[PDB]
Design an enzyme around this catalytic site. Sequence first.
Site, PDB file in Angstrom:
ATOM      1  N   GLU A 775       0.829  -1.222   0.000  1.00 26.96           N
ATOM      2  CA  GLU A 775       0.000   0.000   0.000  1.00 26.96           C
ATOM      3  C   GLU A 775       0.871   1.284   0.000  1.00 26.96           C
ATOM      4  O   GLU A 775       0.520   2.308  -0.664  1.00 26.96           O
ATOM      5  CB  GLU A 775      -0.984  -0.025   1.167  1.00 26.96           C
ATOM      6  CG  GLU A 775      -1.870   1.202   1.219  1.00 26.96           C
ATOM      7  CD  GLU A 775      -2.982   1.142   2.252  1.00 26.96           C
ATOM      8  OE1 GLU A 775      -3.249   0.046   2.764  1.00 26.96           O
ATOM      9  OE2 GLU A 775      -3.574   2.201   2.547  1.00 26.96           O
ATOM     10  N   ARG A 853      -8.529   2.489  13.632  1.00 27.11           N
ATOM     11  CA  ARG A 853      -9.380   1.360  13.284  1.00 27.11           C
ATOM     12  C   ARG A 853      -9.444   0.398  14.479  1.00 27.11           C
ATOM     13  O   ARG A 853     -10.492  -0.149  14.732  1.00 27.11           O
ATOM     14  CB  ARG A 853      -8.926   0.656  11.999  1.00 27.11           C
ATOM     15  CG  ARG A 853      -9.762  -0.567  11.623  1.00 27.11           C
ATOM     16  CD  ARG A 853      -9.478  -1.088  10.221  1.00 27.11           C
ATOM     17  NE  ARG A 853     -10.065  -0.216   9.217  1.00 27.11           N
ATOM     18  CZ  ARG A 853     -11.327  -0.267   8.817  1.00 27.11           C
ATOM     19  NH1 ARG A 853     -12.183  -1.095   9.404  1.00 27.11           N
ATOM     20  NH2 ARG A 853     -11.721   0.510   7.815  1.00 27.11           N
ATOM     21  N   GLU A1234     -10.688  -8.468   4.313  1.00 26.90           N
ATOM     22  CA  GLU A1234     -10.111  -8.371   5.658  1.00 26.90           C
ATOM     23  C   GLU A1234     -10.988  -8.953   6.771  1.00 26.90           C
ATOM     24  O   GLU A1234     -10.460  -9.586   7.681  1.00 26.90           O
ATOM     25  CB  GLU A1234      -9.867  -6.904   5.999  1.00 26.90           C
ATOM     26  CG  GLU A1234      -8.991  -6.192   4.995  1.00 26.90           C
ATOM     27  CD  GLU A1234      -8.871  -4.720   5.322  1.00 26.90           C
ATOM     28  OE1 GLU A1234      -7.876  -4.367   5.977  1.00 26.90           O
ATOM     29  OE2 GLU A1234      -9.787  -3.954   4.961  1.00 26.90           O
TER      30      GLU A1234
HETATM   31  O1  LIG Z   1      -9.567   2.158   6.789  1.00 23.09           O
HETATM   32  C1  LIG Z   1      -8.602   1.648   6.184  1.00 23.09           C
HETATM   33  N1  LIG Z   1      -7.729   2.482   5.557  1.00 23.09           N
HETATM   34  C2  LIG Z   1      -6.664   2.008   4.876  1.00 23.09           C
HETATM   35  O2  LIG Z   1      -5.848   2.785   4.311  1.00 23.09           O
HETATM   36  C3  LIG Z   1      -6.474   0.522   4.820  1.00 23.09           C
HETATM   37  N2  LIG Z   1      -5.574  -0.324   4.276  1.00 23.09           N
HETATM   38  C4  LIG Z   1      -5.968  -1.546   4.608  1.00 23.09           C
HETATM   39  O3  LIG Z   1      -5.303  -2.592   4.254  1.00 23.09           O
HETATM   40  N3  LIG Z   1      -7.101  -1.591   5.312  1.00 23.09           N
HETATM   41  C5  LIG Z   1      -7.483  -0.313   5.517  1.00 23.09           C
HETATM   42  N4  LIG Z   1      -8.487   0.302   6.166  1.00 23.09           N
END
Ligand SMILES: O=c1[nH]c(=O)c2[nH]c(=O)[nH]c2[nH]1
Length: 1295
Positions: A775, A853, A1234
């Site tokens: 990412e 999160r 996820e």
């Molecule tokens: O809320 C999220 N933002 C992200 O940037 C991200 N990246 C990820 O793998 N899961 C999530 N969840």
Amino acid sequence: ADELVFFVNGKKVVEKNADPETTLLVYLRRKLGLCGTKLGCGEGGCGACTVMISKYDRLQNKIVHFSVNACLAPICSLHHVAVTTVEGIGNTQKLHPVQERIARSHGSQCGFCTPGIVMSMYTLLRNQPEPTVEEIENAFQGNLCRCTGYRPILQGFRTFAKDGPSLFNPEDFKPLDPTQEPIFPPELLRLKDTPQKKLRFEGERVTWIQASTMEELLDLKAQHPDAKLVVGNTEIGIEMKFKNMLFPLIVCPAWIPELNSVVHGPEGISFGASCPLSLVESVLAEEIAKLPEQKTEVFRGVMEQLRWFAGKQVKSVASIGGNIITASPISDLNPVFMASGAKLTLVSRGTRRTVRMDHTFFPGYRKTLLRPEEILLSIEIPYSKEGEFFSAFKQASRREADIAKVTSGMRVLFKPGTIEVQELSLCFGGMADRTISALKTTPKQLSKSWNEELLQSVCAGLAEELQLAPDAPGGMVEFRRTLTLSFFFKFYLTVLQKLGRADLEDMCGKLDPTFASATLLFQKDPPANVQLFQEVPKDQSEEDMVGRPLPHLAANMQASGEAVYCDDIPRYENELSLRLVTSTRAHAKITSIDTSEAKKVPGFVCFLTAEDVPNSNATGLFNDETVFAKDEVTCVGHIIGAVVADTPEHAQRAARGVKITYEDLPAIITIQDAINNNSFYGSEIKIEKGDLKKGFSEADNVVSGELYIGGQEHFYLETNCTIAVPKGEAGEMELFVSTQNTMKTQSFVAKMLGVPDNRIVVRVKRMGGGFGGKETRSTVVSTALALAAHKTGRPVRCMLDRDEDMLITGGRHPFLAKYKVGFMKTGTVVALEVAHFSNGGNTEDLSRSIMERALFHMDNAYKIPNIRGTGRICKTNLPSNTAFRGFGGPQGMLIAEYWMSEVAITCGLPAEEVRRKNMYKEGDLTHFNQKLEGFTLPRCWDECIASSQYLARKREVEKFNRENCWKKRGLCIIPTKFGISFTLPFLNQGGALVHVYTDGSVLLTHGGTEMGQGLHTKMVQVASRALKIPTSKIHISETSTNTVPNTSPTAASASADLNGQGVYEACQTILKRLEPFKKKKPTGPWEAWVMDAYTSAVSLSATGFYKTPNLGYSFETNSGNPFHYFSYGVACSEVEIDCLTGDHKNLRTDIVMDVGSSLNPAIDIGQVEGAFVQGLGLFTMEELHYSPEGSLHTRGPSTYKIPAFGSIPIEFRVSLLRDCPNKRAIYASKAVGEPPLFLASSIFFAIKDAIRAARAQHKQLFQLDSPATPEKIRNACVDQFTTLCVTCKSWSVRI
Ligand SMILES: O=c1[nH]c(=O)c2[nH]c(=O)[nH]c2[nH]1
Ligand SMILES: Cc1cc2nc3c(=O)[nH]c(=O)nc-3n(C[C@H](O)[C@H](O)[C@H](O)COP(=O)(O)OP(=O)(O)OC[C@H]3O[C@@H](n4cnc5c(N)ncnc54)[C@H](O)[C@@H]3O)c2cc1C
Ligand code: FES
Ligand code: FES
């Protein structure tokens, strides 16, 4: 001679200048352009490089086939063999049955492992056209897969097994016809007649001698004792590649007949030293089967060690002498050979001696009593005698394909007709710098009777003799000590049984039947799997594939190895290689850099540093990271510079010639270090609801404690890779990258160069795994490489080695949690306060969002009226941690389930009852004030508990537990809620571009990247329904910044929701343009409308876009929706722990998952199993160790153990919830990537229960930190063994 001649896929190769350091993998890929065979690790662990070897065996006089790791096979060892790669068995025009079945069975996701698994299965079928289920699973011990969860691969290949709505149809699979396999090269058959002569190969640094006769070998070693013997190369390959040792003269004796013989004598069987241990296996197997139990005790000992010894690839080439002379402290064989006093014959020119392996054979670290001119000829493995019994033991971190923490051989010989000890031998690996005998403990037991006193004596002895320094390499000192006592206990019990069956029960005594299960050798039941999903309506067009189990569009190409990953792209003639140079200190000023040795390396182009950066050295998501280190390094693995050279070999060597001088600075490694030093990324984050003081005052009970949760390496099987191609004009550059984030890749390269974004194009075809690790952290490679390309005007490429990737790129954030929960006697929770601490490493990256999160998920599934969560992100001198599938959720929810476990037990109520009555209901608000609408979790719960038959299984577990003293079962059912949308609102957007060409075919692209999750497949399914044309007419080639701009990363499970809507809208625009042509010709085909619109000059190109509406939370006001909707699921899992070793079986797991109306139930179930098995690793297997100085020790599959084929729940059941449309997302689907991952906590808490039961058997609210490894499980099963073992500088620190 000096010419190297072999075949590849039936085509002859003559290599006139073979370099000994050239691996077959490098030769196939770089020299022959055959890129189906992959690099995944370089150390023989992952099997992604698996290929088949055929040859005429001169000795058994037949054509043979076996599998090897190409990454470890020297081409100079392959004279007159025939290699077969994935390309050689079939292709998309004509797939081999193996390729067809893995693809159609949904066994290939990201596709990166698929070739090596194909080749394992292919090899098995060439050896055994009708294998057993057992033989099939056994084929893949050397093959790792990170995406699928293995289930579909085995289920697809079960169709080959002799003794073998739905996701696939095995009855459409074309049959195997072995006459159609490729011919064994006739020429190789012709040459079997000619005697072998000695060969000599000369490279840059190394000379390789292939000796044809024993005379030639012994002569060479007499005249040059320094010549390094290489046989399988499974050790030397590692020494050379990972410990930078160089043996300038190698001799390979593999051809010599004396070193490959098998002679049956009176005392045992004698194996030539170069015998592969796969041949040891087949010989001892046949011998065990036909001879009496009485005389095969040692043989069975060896076979038991070999069961857990790597896999088929390694054992095909790894020699028995190889393992002996390596003298690893963790040999699995040397303890067995020693405990059995096996006869080793030694030779040099004009000398020959025989000795028994005892303690003197292994004097010091990696040494033997062999003279330098001497080689090992043979090992006799002995027949056992009447009254002679042997056991072998091994405990690791994972059963299969792992390296021993402790490993042992144990032998007893009884005076005849007695229970009196004549001989005793207890030998151990993993307890010292060598294989050791317990010489000071064993002699005391001579003439003693085999009884409770010998058992206590020996245990007291081993406890004192097998001491470990707290600094002892490998750590786990208590566990390792416990293991030696525990293994001996099993041996003791086993001998009692063996005495028993010899008719001496009267003297030694009977075994208590509750102890019997202790002595049982590992066995697994045959698997059983169930996949339940919903059929689409009767009405639905057969051309409407939405809701149908369409296979991944690239599955066939992935199984064929025709799918192109970044490093598979051919090199430009003028292309250069880059190699990162990284900090070896956690915090320190860079005093000086000396490139003087780096320049002497042939091919060296330059060394890039901060000074060469055109514009900004400031990068990363919060602008707090360096492109290259300037003045100070702030983690071990901080990128200082980059070498550029012609080839990767030359870039690596040059990189070793960059000497750096450091001056250390105060380092901050651990969460505690960080707390003590007030070093944090920003301020405290907080959610708070209700009245916490009141709640705690009202609570009948209050429980307080801590929980640590270890991190996780992504172990995407394709490591990070960028190719940057400079265009020579206007600063234009094109990058080919394995990344989930084209936009940030683009932005970061632009700024680093000081050119506008419109000059930079980032292209992503597909990734071999991402999992959040690509990412952002992909950009550290992308920028270095972009710079090299800009500077040189030449294409530049870098693919990270696994050790590099694991060090530089970081992982899931470790969490430390401090909790205080208040509850009533009913189990109802009334007050919760939890402090969260993450270790974020040396840049902010996504850390703050991850903590958010975690806090958004500290409730898990439970309404808690009075609640306080805080998080603090530690800033440390470690590699920056980043996104990993779950993004803090798993950490959040595990803490919740941990204290919930403690509520349940404090109250003495059943866990499931306490969980259920605490569960939210429809219409409730979360602790962050979002309404739970369409709350399907209760349905998920009631289904899973019923279909898993939870209550009846409870009873069986209770029963097992009171009938077994040294094994225990546990059972747990865990719910989950997972919020769907980026925590950052504006990231909830996506784009598409679609073209209709005049032939009617459609070219589609969107902002999402394919990493094995089947995103393109889904978007094709969507576009097909939207346009009402078959999927056959729609294609997606790649993802690109110059087709769809400003794309959010492929992340937060969101990418199908966002891009699906984009695609949809793009298709709606087209349909609106075609409408008038459709009205004029309602029946005439698509092609006619399209050509009509073209000839009427109507645009057949359209963008589409979507934003997730009505999002935006505030931590100030604790209001607004962070999430568009929630995913929900429930998992019931059962385990059986071994109380004496820490090992466990995952017996059964049942999952009910709410994916709404699945876009693709085949992919969705795949994502459930994949996510689940990653969770399984996180919570039970996967552990990263760091030196106290902050250097990651854990850098390869050897030491980092992800779930194997043998790790998955034996019984594995997945159901997608029926009749639960989620109208707000694309065609009533829900995200899936996820949310399932956390449900593997079911196995964590099932292990918990089993431990609790083990503790009652032999302190309440005991501590179990994640991951719940063998070490922790065994250490928590306190008993008479731990208590005698248990009571500074150390190898590793808890970060
Ligand atoms: O809320 C999220 N933002 C992200 O940037 C991200 N990246 C990820 O793998 N899961 C999530 N969840
Ligand atoms: C993925 C993987 C998993 C592994 N798992 C295990 C495991 O579970 N347990 C375990 O014990 N090991 C394990 N190993 C180590 C290795 O596979 C074994 O030690 C193997 O037997 C080495 O044999 P080789 O023929 O490949 O040796 P090579 O690497 O060819 O040679 C090893 C050493 O032995 C010397 N040598 C070889 N033959 C002779 C001879 N006749 N006389 C004198 N010296 C000789 C060489 O000079 C060298 O010093 C593993 C290795 C890999 C890569
Ligand atoms: S690349 Fe050869 S085993 Fe992993
Ligand atoms: S599908 Fe096996 S590693 Fe990706």
